[PDB]
Amino acid sequence: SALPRQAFGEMADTVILLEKATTTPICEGMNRLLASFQALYLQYQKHHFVVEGAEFYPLHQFFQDCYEQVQDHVHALGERLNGLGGVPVAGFQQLAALCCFTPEPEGAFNCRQMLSNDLQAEQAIIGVLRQQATQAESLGDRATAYLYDQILLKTEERAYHIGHFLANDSLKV
Amino acid sequence: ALPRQAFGEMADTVILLEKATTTPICEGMNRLLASFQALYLQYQKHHFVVEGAEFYPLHQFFQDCYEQVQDHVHALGERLNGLGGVPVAGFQQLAALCCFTPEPEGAFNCRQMLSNDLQAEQAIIGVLRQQATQAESLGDRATAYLYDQILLKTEERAYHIGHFLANDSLKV
Amino acid sequence: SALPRQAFGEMADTVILLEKATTTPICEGMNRLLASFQALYLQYQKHHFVVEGAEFYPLHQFFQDCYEQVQDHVHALGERLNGLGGVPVAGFQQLAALCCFTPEPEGAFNCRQMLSNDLQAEQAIIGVLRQQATQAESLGDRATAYLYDQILLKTEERAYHIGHFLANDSLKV
Amino acid sequence: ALPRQAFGEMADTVILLEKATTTPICEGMNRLLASFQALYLQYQKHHFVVEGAEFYPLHQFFQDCYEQVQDHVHALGERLNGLGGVPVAGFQQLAALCCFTPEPEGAFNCRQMLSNDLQAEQAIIGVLRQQATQAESLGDRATAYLYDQILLKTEERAYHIGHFLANDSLKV
Amino acid sequence: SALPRQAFGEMADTVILLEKATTTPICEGMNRLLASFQALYLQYQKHHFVVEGAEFYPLHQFFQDCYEQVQDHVHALGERLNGLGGVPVAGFQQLAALCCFTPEPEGAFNCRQMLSNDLQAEQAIIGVLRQQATQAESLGDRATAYLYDQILLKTEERAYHIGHFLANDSLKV
Amino acid sequence: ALPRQAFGEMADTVILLEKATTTPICEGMNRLLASFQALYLQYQKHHFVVEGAEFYPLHQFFQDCYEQVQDHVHALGERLNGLGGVPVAGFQQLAALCCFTPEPEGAFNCRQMLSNDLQAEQAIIGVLRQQATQAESLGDRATAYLYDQILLKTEERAYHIGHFLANDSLKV
Amino acid sequence: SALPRQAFGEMADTVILLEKATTTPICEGMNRLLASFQALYLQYQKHHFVVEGAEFYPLHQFFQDCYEQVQDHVHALGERLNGLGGVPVAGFQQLAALCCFTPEPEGAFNCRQMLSNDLQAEQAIIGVLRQQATQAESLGDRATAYLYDQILLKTEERAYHIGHFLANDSLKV
Amino acid sequence: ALPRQAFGEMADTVILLEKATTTPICEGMNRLLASFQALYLQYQKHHFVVEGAEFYPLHQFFQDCYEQVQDHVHALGERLNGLGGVPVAGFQQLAALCCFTPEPEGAFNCRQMLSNDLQAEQAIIGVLRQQATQAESLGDRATAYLYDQILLKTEERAYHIGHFLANDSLKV
Amino acid sequence: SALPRQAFGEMADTVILLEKATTTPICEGMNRLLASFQALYLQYQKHHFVVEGAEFYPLHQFFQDCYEQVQDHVHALGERLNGLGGVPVAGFQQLAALCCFTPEPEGAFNCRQMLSNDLQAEQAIIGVLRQQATQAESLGDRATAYLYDQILLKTEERAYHIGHFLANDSLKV
Amino acid sequence: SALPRQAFGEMADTVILLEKATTTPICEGMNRLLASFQALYLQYQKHHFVVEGAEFYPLHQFFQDCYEQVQDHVHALGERLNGLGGVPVAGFQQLAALCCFTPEPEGAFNCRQMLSNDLQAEQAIIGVLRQQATQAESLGDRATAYLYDQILLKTEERAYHIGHFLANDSLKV
């Protein structure tokens, strides 16, 4: 019924003075990253809620640190995207379509599976971050490339922290 | 692979409540969890896209709202699992259980956004009261209490939105 | 039934060594200021509770800053008044009688009316503050004059902040 | 010398509740106070003596638990006196009113310790619900509320222990 | 039914490399101090809950400061005892048997009696602290002696603070 | 009396960059310094003089802005010296290097104030991109990094101003 | 580019019940102080950036302490001036024209010279602060008098701190 | 060895006040410094030795008092030097300048202690008024301001002591 | 003006179970330290007020750090002495008489002289601290020994910090 | 004493989707920086311990500021290197062998010499940071490039702060 001020998939001009030929592909990629980070945030939260077993407390905390940091990326990207003249994704349908990894299905999985799913997700996002950071640089959008690099550093760090959790070492003697 | 506990499935809880109590409580908690999760997304969108004469107040207001809703999500998500259920997580399942109609894609004006938020809060207030009542009735005293705690904040958000929408201003 | 240790409108000696001829008129004026600040505090609180409309959130906050700061003046004056050997006003009847402005009537008013009422109140208090500060100085009560000046600075600041809210400028285009 | 108010004795309260309400409430509050006091001691012991592969998490977990239980003790101890009763204090009287079986002397393994803690919390959850229900029923609204507040945290501790005990780990 | 990993009154080796002939008597004394501090903690807490009369608020607070500080000693001793290869006391029976003072009987006593009981308790603990600190030094356990001295300083301080409360001076004119 | 280093004179840096690199870099950095210094003064003025229906939030926004800008001033002035240059400080030189046209004396309406601020941020955005690209190209990695960091914040202030200026409002 | 709502050098009415006969001379003087403090903030900041040599670190810190305190004076004065119904100076020409001291020329001078220039600036401002405070008192603007004295105390304090820096003493052999 | 500046010798101040102004002002400021220094020592002693029924609150009050007084000491000693004088520091000179009679050695009862403290504050109140009036009259606005600020706090300590000494009590 | 409850130089019983044979010599020595630290606090404070020249700022700060740390020692000692059953010195005559070093004469000296006087004071106090700690240990007052060692560590640290200030090195060409 | 899970100088796979062709040279260079920063932390800490003379206090503080900031670089680099699939250096032989500057010999040198040695160290590290950042960018490791630039900015800043300390200016007559 009600028509929006700016339709989804429509570009407005940005006051930071970058051409639409620059902002359009950047927003396209940023919405994919937004959606992917949003899914990852929900997934990490889920994993915080449901994790159990011998490594419960450490994983419980780790999963919270992850979704809180990922929440930060969501915030940064959604706000910048709008700033660039785009419309950030917010509905379940379009969020699911733009997500760059396959989320864990509903239901509770064991802790190794949860971590593996989270790692695969981070790895998928790492791939998109690099591709999008290279694009931003290429197109002259310096701040975006800088922001993505900032996000990439913490995202990679999250990935190899999961890697360590899954490694084959233990105090079990 | 399949999960160790399916969605919709109930496990036993260590907190000495029977399935007949935990089951309808968890099912209601999931509807509420989905709705809060959907409302967090909506407020956050509004924070991202709001503009105009009241940009700064609404900007900050939407953030306060979604951060407060994030607290409810955490509380409900963890309680639900504690009660022996499986909390809703992903986009498609959230869409299925959300108790209000989420805003369509696209950026709408600030009055429309606030109205959408108010309706969302009202739908949630509706469910909160009924679920808290059910929990009291079934003897889950702590769930009823938690819901009441959340209700107080939720009503407060709702009537704060109402004030923003009210027919008054400094414009003379 | 029970008789007070010190009756209202009765002066005791102060340990800070100022004559009754000094402390009596100073306490008389300070009770008027106490009562006036008490009414203003309640009024600002009211305005915080009831304000609505397009400028809801900013006014909501502003009204709170005001009653919190005014609360501070109430505290300072009530305690000093007792220190000077007087009895601070505390009952509704005498509070209403000593108040130096007309408070807003009961019921909810619009935001421009609320601000106008608050401004008139502050202006009435400003007038009494200057008169009382000049008196204290004149009578040799240095600390009182200093305290009133301190209160006057913040009170005036509150007044012109209300003035700005009511000014004829807007982003409404 | 003899006390000005004996143990088991009720005085009048200034909060306008009659003996017929305050008496059974205080008696229940004492059972709960003793049990929390006994649970604080147990968690603290576990904090002192835990070792093995999950030393650091359990170490910290046991401390969080007893510190949270210390908060309940304070709340109940002070409320009980406020209601006109005498709070249990010493070792032997605590032993008499404790609603669970305390762990024997000696250091046990970490699974046993957690199981003992879970049973302790469950026994306490049992009493909490019944005492809160009694308080609502008798019209002591604030006691019922306080108990609910404590119940929420107590259930949360219980199901956190359950998760630790659950059959899952990173061991592949 | 279930047998412990380490039975109460049984000594394991400590990784801090002190002989059992050293650690055994030290743990024996430390368990007495643990039990005594545990009783004192409960007693101070009780006194916080039940204190009334003209000096209610100050005593209320003081009793809390005491049990919080005593709680700290409990923590330090229980953890070190286990570290030394002993088993800390935790059951009501053995706690009552190892306590070095007679605790106040159940029921509410007046404020002077409560303080006197608390003072006698502190004095009993002071005696054991000195004896045990001298032993630790004598046996070459330097850190224990240091820890006890640290605890002794605060314990003595608590004692003479109670002493002052009970002294025969007052503003009562 | 003569200065240790004259304005416009380049000294060697301890950070191992040739003068042919530091000279153009300091030249640009002085323009940005002067521009940020002017924008700081402008935002501060706006904080002082703003009034009307949106007085309070604009009052706050302007202060957030100048405080953030003062942080850019600090970083650039200090790095410029570090690089072996001399930072501008005087009114005449500031006026000469500034990359936007400053608001004239007088108290303007809040829409005009915001528009002047946007234009100032836009002019600065252009210079930052230019100077960042130059620093990278010359191998002053740290300056390029610093500029990007400042550019991200500057663009953010710019689009926040844009939102304030947009044609939307709660007044229906 | 529209006209200003209030032109520079034009007085508006104040909400705080002071006549234009009072507010006009006060605002004129307040603008000279505003400009002076604004130039001094810049100078101190410059000195923070450029200072080097044997006392680099303490001078580096001292100059920052100074300019941060000066910007507080700026804030207070700019906002008070506006509240009084005047227009605060913000452009480079008029800031240069109203400044009550001669700013240091462009270029990096030695630390002794920098400190001497700062002291001369403080001294010129001290002179103006006293005249203006006296004027405010004289005209019945008690709050402006108070604010000035408050600023004067901090300013004199900076001045004699610089004095000590310049004093003929050191730890050198 | 001889001092850079002898006690009782006036140097010029950088704050542009003639010696005919600073000399009497520093003279009085030294008396206040010595008096506050003595009162600091007295309040501190009282904090050490107080006992009885009101031990704890008096213990606290005395400490609040000396800490506030130490703040007056700091401000006056530093301003006095700033003004071109030399602050008193030695026991003999302190004893000579002090405006009240200090409590003799020994531990007195808490009523006596409080009374001595009141008398000390009263003596100081008199000097502050005198010295503040003088500073104003001589055109040392900032000193007068500082004295008034200190006087407000000092009068407040004085009437707080007065209240402690009043003939009222909970003991019926 | 009534008599003291406990005369100066008279010993009362202590609640901490130490005999007068022990507490008397300990309190005598503790009073000498109390007086010395009291004189040193004054001296360091004086130095804070008067220091000027090339190292004004760091010396200004250092002297404040010093006197604030010294007043903590004063607090600890005054309260411990009282708790032991003695009477702490507070009058100017006896403070001068019990002080274990010669205070700096009145007047503003140079910074090197000020530092040398402070070092000599610390050194005299260091001597007394060691004798008194040894005595406390010897007499079985373990807590006083501990408190003294605690104070000694901080005191020696101040002493060698002054030493470094006075050392024959600088950044001057 | 078992074998290491990953031998020094051996590369493991990284979870962040960078090939060994990329991670190997990056980790090699990162280890040289790790060792260098490790030696510099030690040096700055040493300088904190030993500095004396007329600028004792500010240099004392500056050296602590420096080593604390350097240990943050160490933390970041050690953890990043591991996350990339390498093995961080921690033994004394290899720390000495991989260090990119010559550490100050044992003994306490003068403050000018200490500062010069620190500047030379920073300069050598600045050189390596630039090569390594360029290499990381070149090989497509965007996050390592970003981290290095982040560290470079702080490092250059320390370097020119030392420069100012050494500069030919002072407050001496």
Next chain:
Amino acid sequence: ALPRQAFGEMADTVILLEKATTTPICEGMNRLLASFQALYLQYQKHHFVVEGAEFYPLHQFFQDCYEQVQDHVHALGERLNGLGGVPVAGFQQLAALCCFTPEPEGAFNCRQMLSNDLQAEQAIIGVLRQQATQAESLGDRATAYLYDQILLKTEERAYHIGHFLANDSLKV
């Protein structure tokens, strides 16, 4: 260039201890400094390289450990200079004075890492006792006090490592 004070050269201390006291005391303090410095590096390495089922808590434990050890380093290095000695700083001298055998290069399993850390703490515990006893005996009360304080913390780290290494686990 030659140092102001050569390594192994003793200067006089301002704290009035003869060289015959300070020399052996500084000798031992340098060994402890070197040992703590090495243990700091080792704990830090362990923090970097740890992985597996107990990754997170061990990651945290190692960091708590090295930060506490860095505090011991600071206190000893500074006191050693204060005492008139020269603290070790170079890799070769550090390696020479260290009282335990440091872990070789390479990433070892978490059990090995913990065992190396325990052994290091044990070796250090022995030296601390020796050096503390010596300081007391020589009349350096403050050094003995400092060593005891450090020893208490060191023993605590040691028995915490012991607990981690114990044969208990939640995995049944």
